[PDB]
Write a protein that binds this ligand. Structure first.
Ligand SMILES: CCCCCCCCCCCCCCCCCC(=O)OC[C@H](COP(=O)([O-])OCC(O)COP(=O)([O-])OC[C@@H](COC(=O)CCCCCCCCCCCCCCCCC)OC(=O)CCCCCCCCCCCCCCCCC)OC(=O)CCCCCCCCCCCCCCCCC
Ligand SMILES: CCCCCCCCCCCCCCCCCC(=O)OC[C@H](COP(=O)([O-])OCC[N+](C)(C)C)OC(=O)CCCCCCCCCCCCCCCCC
Ligand SMILES: CCCCCCCCCCCCCCCCCC(=O)OC[C@H](COP(=O)([O-])OCC[N+](C)(C)C)OC(=O)CCCCCCCCCCCCCCCCC
Ligand SMILES: CCCCCCCCCCCCCCCCCC(=O)OC[C@H](COP(=O)(O)OCCN)OC(=O)CCCCCCCCCCCCCCCCC
Ligand SMILES: CCCCCCCCCCCCCCCCCC(=O)OC[C@H](COP(=O)(O)OCCN)OC(=O)CCCCCCCCCCCCCCCCC
Lengths: 175, 115, 70, 99, 114, 318, 83, 347, 98
């Protein structure tokens, strides 16, 4: 319920990740990944990251993964390797649905899950901070500083992107 | 509360609308009916082959181009900064480099993709 | 002639007519005649939460002013 | 850095953003501006070795400020005992709990 | 490692203004300049003392200094207040641009009444 | 009562889409000196009903080499996204007053390409496969101009809040400030929505029926409904963006009159274009976008970023 | 001279697009420096009070800061409403 | 590839490494690593042979994975400390996290599996850049964060680097694979002393730089890639084979040659740090490098392998290359032991 | 530490395993790589938004625009492999060997 709503979105995020990480068909893996891409935005939205949340929709859901479909349409291994095609992918998918189900139950009971880090299984809502942001959206003012203080990053990010296009055509030119 | 509720309503509306478009018409498909249509003639076995480079080349250029435009969404709030001169110079830089990437891509064939 | 297409598009204008009227009137009706007080920033939101708590009935849209103070 | 060119010529490239108590847009604060400012001024002109132990108090306080581990554990133990008690019907929450 | 000292609820039972948001916004301009001295004292304490518990005495003063600002206008033209804050309340964003006539009528009294 | 309002929004649009087939059929016929549907009911008013319930009663044949789960998910995404396109619209008072509605508008519109890619792959035929691949290739080329146009257009607005567009155009239409972009935005909307000359995605004459080359009966309407729903929404989006209307708070009725009347005019000129121009070609489709559209959009964006600074006319972010 | 005018006009004969974009982008960068309103733009941008102007501790001998938000002392923006 | 394009691609690769060494912010450190990666692949693609494509693909997958894995070390350190400054970080798991993340870029542990194969596929000039310049950037981070490292974890990674790097070298015919295995072995020597004193980690770097420039550009001048192909070079230009055997002996570390200077100082440092078993074992494994070093020296100039009658044309013509900085390279790479106390300049 | 942070951290770790545990389609491998960064992009937003590190709202885009750059390289290498070999298999991508 809405008590632990962000508990939910985080959960489909994990199962969405287990989807493509289980190495299913690249389109199906794309389907599982974009599902995780879709649900992950809600996690950021719940924290007030509307601008950041909307971007991953734009340049990662409607961005990177669209051209991924081209290579899948270009690869086209002679038979679909959808989940029914192989049995290891089922085992990979089935497995990846266990331990995260195990530790949430581990975290829901006593909350003292010590996997690598100590972790609290308390409700997602707690770690939020109380305080008005006035009229300036904190997310917006942070990003807009791109052109105020992020001068140095802008040059390096731009220069690499320019070098990004010079390499891509050069490697793909095939001599 | 309302946002995914609005998202929820549309998906059910779509799913039932195809559901009563699927079970209602009393599906009566045969083997030849479900056979692929290829201009009325025999398919020779295909749709599993690579397609050169032009479709891939434009996709990557679009992806790279989409990434730079991603860098320049925050401009409407950027104009509200205190130091416009730095912001004016910096935003102009992204656009001219966006131009330069297009400029090189144009000059070295590029957008005239392979055939 | 072209007066025969107007019956088609006049219905069209009526179709797009409905969503505007509904969301306008439901906002008016639910929020006691006034429009839905939008909160694009946290300031406007905590303005409303003050109104909801200060109304004495736990609805923000119920506005009640100088009749209270003494 | 390995070659602190920034210090030599004095052009700020990245350090404007390395910590959250520096200048921020519209002069709005971070969550732990008060704590990290205290830790920073504690560990200035001291050295990494000495500041590890001498300014320990300012550190774990600042770490607790942004992690909020023991505070969350404090609330968890408060809540855990509550449901371990009210379910037995030993104490009833007052009206202000329920509004 | 100590006590989070909190004031007792006794000193927190201070008179609170009971007016809708639009009432504050409509008279905000005519409230800020005319009750500045206690407002500045309280908010100076907030930024200087840096602790909420230190400015409790001033916290009730501004609230009190709000009430005697919100009382004479009742003994004066409260009627132009009514429709002015009503018209402002109608606006979704409480924009002054739409309702300027009632603003003029409200401004006309306080130029002479108080 | 938030729920009844939702059906008050999605139901009329679906009925609007059905009637859009009739008016387009008649108007396109009238350009061709024909009459269009006038036998089925008075002036063909019941033709949308006749077409709708005939296709529903036609079996939804699934192709032999199709992933049924893959075949079905694509219409669900396509139709739901098209109906979701209207939830932030500033129709009197916007339903979902998302402060970043324009980004939400663009992200959902860009997510529509997954229906095109998935439909082509699930059909599993060479004709459908290359039909879809070029379809998305046409699709993915243009929204970069869409984003650039909006960034330049919205720059003088103040933010990405769609409701703020009303107060920006309170005096004059926003087209007058950016009419080079207005035609820039308009043409790109046809390419996104895949109408002639940008119909090579479907190409009735030369690509049979594009990605709908096989897609039949039951779920075919979903792409057809989603396609035509986008036509109104894109024209509605253009209507608010450039052809703004005055909005009296005490009478939202009036601005609805102006917004509605404009958006049929914008849809009418859509199929007006269809009934006049030859269909484009894949290479010209890319060449026109990347050679004569992208450079112009860049410069105009450069013109419109610096314009508020050189005139001290930056807009408030609120 | 002769080549430049011929080349520019000749280019405008085949391609009118990029010469138009180059001209617009050419304008888009110079006049921002030459405009007299950019200083006005940053002045009004600084004039917007997003945050509270926290009061300053009055200890005497700062006459510039007013003691009331009506006194003539302090910054004034009578240009702004005219601007 | 157009020389102007080639020059720019190298220019960014150099700047990307330069960016890493000059950034006080963790994000910028990552920026340098990725944009250095972003321009490394096309250089490996200059020849564009199917072997190169296999090499470049292998190189990109491991480097991108290591760089992406590097982000969590930054993020986790961020999460537990909120500090983007590149300093002594505050999480053992994050400290552990990056140590293998950077190690994969250097290729010391089993991570090293990409180092040989990528060098084999790509051209001699590209291998020279990959094995010399592309090792400064990962080392730069380790030098700055040396104070936070777990001693046990890093010493192990160094150990298997010299251990496996030297051990497999006995079974390499292709000179390119020999050089990479030598590189992995030399990687361990610098990395071992890294937690103790960073001064001679650098000293090992420039010195190890000198031979690898010396050897590779000698090999390029020889235009030979295999042991047998190298053997025939005695007939054409016996002098070059003579200098190569000097460097081969020097890179092996025999005194008074230059290559002994690093190892000697390395042993001295950890001996001061009470670690005396650790230096001894690396010295024992140092002879493993010397063996195939001798085998190449035996094949190159110490003996005289048979030649081919087609070598007679090579006598008539001459080399058109300019081998810039080759003269001073080998001299600085074979006799600099008397100038050892100059290492205090690095401090 | 909040339960959600496990979900992204474990999402990365299982994404990391899929990147390393291969199969026969390095196309699928690239999916785990870009999913890998998506968790990195997602998680980075949580801390920065939570702690109000306003100027640090920078890097989620910066990390995005650079992780997206590797897609350009990775996918370009994909078609290069799928041209000298035709397919995107990984077992056949062993021509180096010696
Ligand atoms: C410490 C002590 C020891 C180190 C001392 C410091 C010096 C170290 C390097 C020594 C020389 C190395 C060398 O060149 O060996 C020959 C070796 C092979 O030379 P080659 O046989 O002529 O073939 C080279 C190309 O394949 C030929 O390709 P091409 O035919 O296309 O010709 C391209 C060539 C020809 O030159 C040009 O084209 C000039 C540029 C024209 C266009 C741009 C003009 C405007 C910009 C100019 C910038 C200068 O230009 C370049 O290769 C570009 C790189 C050099 C110029 C830019 C330098 C960075 C800025 O060089 C290379 O392979 C170059 C590798 C990259 C540079 C050296 C990297 C290794 C050393 C790293 C560590 C350095 C110390 C760190 C501490
Ligand atoms: C190349 C074109 C872009 C760089 C030069 C023009 C912009 C300069 C600039 O923004 O400087 C910011 C700063 C100086 O700041 P500034 O004084 O221009 O602006 C300060 C603004 N506030 C007060 C809000 C922080 O300089 C740099 O970042 C220089 C980076 C290196 C530039 C050269 C790289 C080669
Ligand atoms: C101080 C002033 C600042 C601003 C100054 C700006 C410059 C002056 C104004 C220039 C014109 C406006 C900007 C450019 C517009 C054209 C862009 C372009 O590429 O044009 C050539 C392009 C391409 O022409 P082309 O392909 O023949 O030639 C281009 C050049 N070569 C050959 C080198 C490639 O024209 C088109 O694309 C034709 C239209 C295609 C779409 C088909 C449908 C058209 C429907 C038209 C009717 C409806 C219009 C609706 C308008 C909106 C209503 C809301
Ligand atoms: C103000 C003062 C200056 C005014 C303008 C003066 C200069 C005018 C230059 C005119 C264009 C260059 C000359 C020319 O006519 O080039 C034609 C040629 C056509 O190319 P194409 O159609 O592909 O056919 C040939 C190749 N197959 O063109 C080409 O091949 C060049 C392709 C270049 C691609 C990028 C072009 C710019 C894109 C927009 C950049 C942003 C806007 C402008 C910014 C300017 C900043 C200074
Ligand atoms: C630390 C231990 C030692 C380490 C180094 C050991 C190196 C050698 C080890 C063995 C190497 C393998 C076996 C021998 C290989 C020989 C390679 C070769 O090319 O031999 C043949 C070649 C023929 O000679 P050529 O090249 O024609 O040059 C003649 C001089 N012009 O010969 C040559 O090319 C050799 C040319 C040598 C030229 C020497 C010039 C000396 C000049 C001295 C000047 C002194 C000035 C004094 C001033 C005093 C006052 C200040």
């Amino acid at each position: 319920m809405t008590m632990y709503i962000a508990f939910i979105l985080s959960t489909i995020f994990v199962i969405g990740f287990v989807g493509f990480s289980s190495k299913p068909s690249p389109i199906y893996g794309g389907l599982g990944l974009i599902v995780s891409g879709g649900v992950g935005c809600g996690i950021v939205l719940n924290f007030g990251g509307s601008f950041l949340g909307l971007m991953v929709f734009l340049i990662y859901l409607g961005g990177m993964l669209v051209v991924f479909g081209y290579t899948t349409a270009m690869a086209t291994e002679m038979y679909p390797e959808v989940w029914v095609s192989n049995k290891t992918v089922f085992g990979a998918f089935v497995s990846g649905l266990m331990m995260e189900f195990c530790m949430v139950y581990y975290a829901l009971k006593e909350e003292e899950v010590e996997i690598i880090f100590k972790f609290n299984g308390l409700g997602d809502w707690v770690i939020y901070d109380t305080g008005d942001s006035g009229f300036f959206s904190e997310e917006a003012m942070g990003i807009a500083a791109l052109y105020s203080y992020g001068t140095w990053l802008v040059i390096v990010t731009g220069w690499s992107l320019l070098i990004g296009v010079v390499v891509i055509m050069e490697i793909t030119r095939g001599n | 509360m309302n946002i995914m509720l609005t998202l929820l309503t549309n998906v059910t509306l779509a799913s039932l609308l195809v559901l009563i478009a699927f079970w209602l018409p009393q599906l009566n498909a045969y083997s030849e009916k479900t056979s692929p249509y290829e201009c009325g003639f025999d398919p020779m076995g295909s749709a599993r082959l690579p397609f050169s480079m032009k479709f891939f080349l434009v996709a990557i250029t679009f992806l790279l181009f989409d990434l730079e435009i991603a860098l320049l969404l925050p401009l409407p709030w950027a104009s509200q900064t205190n130091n416009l001169k730095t912001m004016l110079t910096m935003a102009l830089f992204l656009l001219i480099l966006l131009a330069a990437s297009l400029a090189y891509e144009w000059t070295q064939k590029g957008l005239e993709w392979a055939e | 002639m072209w007066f025969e297409i107007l019956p088609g598009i006049a219905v069209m204008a009526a179709c797009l007519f409905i969503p505007g009227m509904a969301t306008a009137h439901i906002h008016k009706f639910t929020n006691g005649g006034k429009e839905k007080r939008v909160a694009h920033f946290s300031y406007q939101w905590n303005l409303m939460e003050r109104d909801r708590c200060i109304s004495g009935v736990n609805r923000y849209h119920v506005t009640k002013g100088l009749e209270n103070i003494d | 850095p390995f070659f602190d060119v920034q210090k030599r010529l004095g052009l700020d490239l990245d350090r404007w953003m390395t910590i959250q108590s520096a200048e921020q847009p519209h002069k709005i604060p971070g969550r732990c501006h008060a704590f990290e400012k205290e830790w920073i001024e504690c560990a200035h002109g001291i050295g990494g070795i000495r500041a590890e132990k001498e300014c320990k108090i300012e550190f774990d306080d600042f770490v607790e400020c942004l992690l909020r581990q023991k505070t969350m554990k404090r609330l968890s133990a408060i809540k855990r005992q509550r449901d371990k008690l009210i379910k037995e019907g030993k104490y009833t929450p007052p009206p202000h709990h329920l509004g | 490692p100590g006590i989070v000292e909190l004031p007792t609820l006794e000193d927190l039972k201070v008179q609170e203004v009971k007016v809708s948001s639009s009432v504050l916004k409509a008279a905000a301009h005519h409230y800020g300049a005319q009750c500045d001295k206690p407002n500045k004292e309280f908010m100076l304490c907030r930024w200087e003392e840096k602790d909420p518990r230190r400015c409790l005495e001033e916290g009730k003063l501004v609230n009190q200094c709000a009430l005697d600002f919100f009382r004479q206008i009742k003994r004066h033209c409260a009627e132009p207040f009514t429709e002015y804050w009503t018209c402002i309340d109608y606006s979704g964003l409480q924009l002054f641009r739409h309702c300027r006539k009632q603003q003029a009528k409200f401004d006309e009294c306080v130029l002479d009444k108080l | 009562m938030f729920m009844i309002n939702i059906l008050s929004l999605i139901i009329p649009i679906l009925l609007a889409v059905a009637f859009l087939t009739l008016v387009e059929r008649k108007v396109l016929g009238y350009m061709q000196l024909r009459k269009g549907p006038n036998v089925v009911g008075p002036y063909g008013l019941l033709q949308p009903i006749a077409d709708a319930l005939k296709l529903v009663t036609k079996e939804p044949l699934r192709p032999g080499t199709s992933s049924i789960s893959m075949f079905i998910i694509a219409p669900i995404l396509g139709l739901s996204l098209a109906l979701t396109m209207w939830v932030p619209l500033p129709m009197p008072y916007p339903l979902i007053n998302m402060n970043l509605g324009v980004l939400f508008m663009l992200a959902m519109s860009s997510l529509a390409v997954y229906s095109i890619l998935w439909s082509g792959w699930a059909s599993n035929s060479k004709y459908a496969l290359i039909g879809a691949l070029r379809a998305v290739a046409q699709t993915i080329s243009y929204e970069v101009t869409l984003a650039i146009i909006l960034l330049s257009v919205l720059l003088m607005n103040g933010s990405y809040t769609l409701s703020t567009l009303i107060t920006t155009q309170e005096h004059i239409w926003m087209i007058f400030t950016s009419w080079p972009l207005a035609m820039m935005w308009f043409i790109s909307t046809l390419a996104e929505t895949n109408r002639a000359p940008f119909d090579l995605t479907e190409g009735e004459s030369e690509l049979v029926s594009g990605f709908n080359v096989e897609y039949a009966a039951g779920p075919f309407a979903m792409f057809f409904m989603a396609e035509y729903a986008n036509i109104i929404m894109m024209n509605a989006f253009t209507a608010i963006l450039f052809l703004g209307a005055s909005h009296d708070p005490h009478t939202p009725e009036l601005y609805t009159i102006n917004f509605v009347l404009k958006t049929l005019a914008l849809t009418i000129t859509f199929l007006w274009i269809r009934a006049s121009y030859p269909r484009f070609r894949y290479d010209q489709l890319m060449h026109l976008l990347w050679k004569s559209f992208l450079p112009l959009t860049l410069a105009l964006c450069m013109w419109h970023i610096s314009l508020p600074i050189m005139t001290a006319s930056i807009p408030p972010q609120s | 001279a002769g080549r430049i005018a011929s080349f520019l006009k000749n280019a405008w004969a085949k391609e009118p697009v990029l010469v138009a974009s180059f001209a617009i982008g050419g304008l888009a960068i110079i006049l921002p420096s030459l405009s007299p309103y950019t200083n006005y733009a940053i002045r009004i941008n600084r004039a917007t009070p997003y945050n509270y102007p926290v009061p300053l501790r009055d200890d005497g001998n700062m006459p510039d800061v007013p003691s009331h938000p009506q006194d003539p002392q302090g910054p004034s923006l009578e240009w702004l409403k005219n601007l | 590839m157009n020389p102007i394009i080639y020059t720019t691609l190298i220019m960014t690769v150099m700047s990307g490494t330069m960016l890493v060494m000059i950034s006080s912010h963790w994000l910028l450190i990552w920026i340098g690593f990725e944009m250095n990666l972003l321009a490394m692949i096309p250089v490996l693609m200059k020849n564009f042979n199917p072997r190169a494509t296999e090499a470049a693909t292998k190189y990109f997958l491991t480097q991108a994975t290591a760089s992406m894995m590097l982000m969590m070390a930054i993020i986790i350190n961020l999460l537990y400390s909120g500090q983007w400054t590149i300093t002594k970080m505050f999480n053992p798991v994050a400290m552990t996290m990056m140590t293998m993340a950077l190690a994969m870029k250097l290729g010391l542990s089993p991570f090293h599996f990409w180092v040989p194969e990528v060098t084999q596929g790509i051209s001699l000039q590209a291998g020279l850049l990959l094995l010399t310049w592309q090792k400064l950037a990962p080392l730069s981070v380790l030098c700055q964060i040396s104070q936070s490292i777990n001693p046990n974890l890093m010493l192990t990674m160094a150990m298997l680097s010299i251990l496996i790097g030297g051990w497999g070298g006995l079974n390499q015919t292709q000179l390119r694979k020999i050089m990479a295995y030598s590189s992995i072995a030399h990687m361990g020597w610098m990395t071992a002393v890294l937690p103790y004193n960073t001064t001679m980690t650098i000293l090992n770097l420039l010195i190890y730089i000198t031979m690898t420039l010396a050897m590779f550009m000698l090999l390029i001048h020889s235009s030979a890639t295999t042991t047998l192909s190298l053997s025939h070079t005695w007939n054409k230009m016996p002098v070059i084979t003579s200098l190569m055997m000097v460097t081969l002996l020097s890179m092996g570390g025999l005194p008074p040659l230059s290559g002994f200077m690093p190892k000697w100082m390395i042993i001295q440092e950890m001996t001061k740090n009470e670690s005396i078993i650790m230096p001894t074992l690396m010295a024992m494994t140092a002879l493993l490098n010397l063996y195939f070093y001798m085998r190449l020296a035996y094949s190159s100039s110490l003996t005289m392998f048979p030649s081919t009658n087609n070598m007679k044309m090579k006598w008539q013509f001459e080399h058109t290359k300019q081998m810039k900085l080759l003269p001073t390279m080998i001299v600085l790479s074979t006799l600099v032991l008397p100038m050892t106390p100059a290492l205090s300049s690095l401090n | 530490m909040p339960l959600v942070y496990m979900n992204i951290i474990m999402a990365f770790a299982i994404a990391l395993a899929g990147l390393l545990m291969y199969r026969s389609h390095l196309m699928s491998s690239l999916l785990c790589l870009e999913g890998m960064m998506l968790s990195l992009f997602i998680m980075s937003t949580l801390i920065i938004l939570n702690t109000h590190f306003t100027l640090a709202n920078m890097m989620p885009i910066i990390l995005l625009v650079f992780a997206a750059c590797e897609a350009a390289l990775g996918l370009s290498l994909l078609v290069m492999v799928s041209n000298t070999y035709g397919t995107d298999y990984v077992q056949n991508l062993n021509l180096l060997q010696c």
